[PDB]
Design a protein around this ligand. Structure first.
Ligand SMILES: *[C@@H]1O[C@H](CO)[C@@H](O)[C@H](O)[C@H]1NC(C)=O
Length: 334
């Protein structure tokens, strides 16, 4: 079942690492800054029931069930595990607005929210855009719920991530794509399987050094960076002349623009990033260090080992997520 509505969510670009939009939960709406994340499937926001001893709950918007006349209790415990951290809490049901679409949605009220990393979040919560199969507690994801309404023109959603300074930080179209933010044709790659926004990758090139037998690529709107496995990144970085630090790889800022192209071989086409697309050029000095927007992340089975194509990739390539045809479309962003 399909309608005729298309709907956009305006996103704020925080330091090229966090892309978030506004959603409203409850009656009247309590507003939250949320990351729309294709790598997970649960909605959560911090709870008023979160102990103030969690400092992250002091520094973020808290959902207060006691102020919502449309709240429906459930209370089942849930733990959501991400790459960079974990949240715990319980399930609740309420009205959620996103792009002027209202859905009754089960979501997590988070009562346990670690200061690292959640103090470093501009956003309050997460809206998972993954499939029900990856949803913790088998809770229906928000998009599946929007699909049930039969209002969207297509069973698709699209991401645009900008660079950044008083302009559009990003955009999610629910029900289509926006031609004003892409050019040329979409080139589609089918998913490995329905359930995960993951596709076959045929190779990674520096300047084909890596993934020469084929590997996996998670198209992850909630990942800031392009990530590969530890040994894959170690080899990638050796070729770039980049040195390892605790959380990132750095190159000396001067040698930044001279860094080779990195190409990802997806569904026939070759998706190339220049150094400008993956280096945080904050200086041109030899005596300063510059961070690369490519990280090591060992994603566990059964999803892993896999590469993750995050904001670094999506900035260059406007991404359409097709649920009806179980594929991902890429076009040149503008
Ligand atoms: C929570 O939701 C599940 C599944 O919809 C349901 O079976 C259960 O009874 C609910 N629990 C409470 C306490 O509302």
């Amino acid at each position: 079942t399909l309608g005729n509505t298309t709907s956009s969510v305006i996103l704020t670009n925080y330091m090229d690492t966090q892309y978030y939009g506004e959603i409203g939960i409850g009656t009247p709406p309590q507003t939250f800054k949320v990351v729309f994340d294709t790598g997970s499937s649960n909605v959560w926001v911090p709870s008023s029931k979160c102990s103030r001893l969690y400092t992250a709950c002091v520094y973020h918007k808290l959902f207060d069930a006691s102020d919502s006349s449309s709240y429906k209790h459930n209370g089942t415990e849930l733990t959501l595990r991400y790459s960079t951290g974990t949240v715990s809490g319980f399930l609740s049901q309420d009205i959620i607005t996103v792009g002027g679409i209202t859905v009754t949605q089960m979501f997590g009220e988070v009562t346990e929210m670690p200061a690292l990393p959640f103090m470093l979040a501009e956003f309050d919560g997460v809206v998972g855009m993954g499939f029900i199969e990856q949803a913790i507690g088998r809770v229906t994801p928000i998009f599946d719920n929007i699909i049930s309404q039969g209002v969207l023109k297509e069973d698709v959603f699209s991401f645009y991530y900008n660079r950044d300074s008083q302009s559009l930080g990003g955009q999610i179209v629910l029900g289509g794509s926006d031609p004003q933010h892409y050019e040329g044709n979409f080139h589609y790659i089918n998913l490995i399987k329905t359930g995960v926004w993951q596709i076959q990758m045929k190779g990674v090139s520096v300047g084909t050094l890596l993934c020469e037998d084929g590997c996996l690529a998670l198209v992850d709107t909630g990942a800031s960076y392009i990530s590969g496995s530890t040994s894959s990144i170690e080899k990638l970085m050796e070729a770039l002349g980049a040195k390892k630090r605790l959380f990132d790889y750095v190159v000396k800022c001067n040698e930044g623009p001279t860094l080779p192209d990195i190409s990802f071989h997806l569904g026939g086409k070759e998706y190339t990033l220049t150094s400008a697309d993956y280096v945080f050029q904050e200086s041109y000095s030899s005596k300063k260090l510059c961070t690369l927007a490519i990280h090591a992340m060992d994603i566990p089975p059964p999803t892993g080992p896999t590469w993750a194509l995050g904001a670094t990739f999506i900035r260059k390539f406007y991404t359409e997520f097709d649920r009806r045809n179980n594929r991902i479309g890429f076009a040149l962003a503008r």
